[PDB]
Amino acid sequence: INTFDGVADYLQTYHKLPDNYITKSEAQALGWVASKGNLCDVAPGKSIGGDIFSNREGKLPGKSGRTWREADINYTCGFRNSDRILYSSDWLIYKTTDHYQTFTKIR
């Protein structure tokens, strides 16, 4: 489960990310070196997902008590790509395919 549609349904259907996701910190603990693009060598079949996404720029809709999280989409080993899914604690789902510059609602 690593497609935009897959993960969105999943997030709304189950209220968590699918088993293939791990956080950055979690990843570093297993030997992931961002500079080497080695996530698949140290954690086969996993993607970075679940971290808190600051929304400093105020690009995504704010609401007191609403927390945003991100997850990588379409990852297939090597260096991470520019696709991400963004989901709020009240299950609003946005997408970015340009490294968090622009967002469009998907759920």
Swiss-Prot record:
This is Ribonuclease. It comes from the Bacteria. It is an enzyme of class 3 (hydrolase). Its EC number is 3.1.27.-. The chain holds residues 51 to 157 of 157 of the full protein. Belongs to the ribonuclease N1/T1 family. The active site is at E70, H99. It is found in: Secreted.
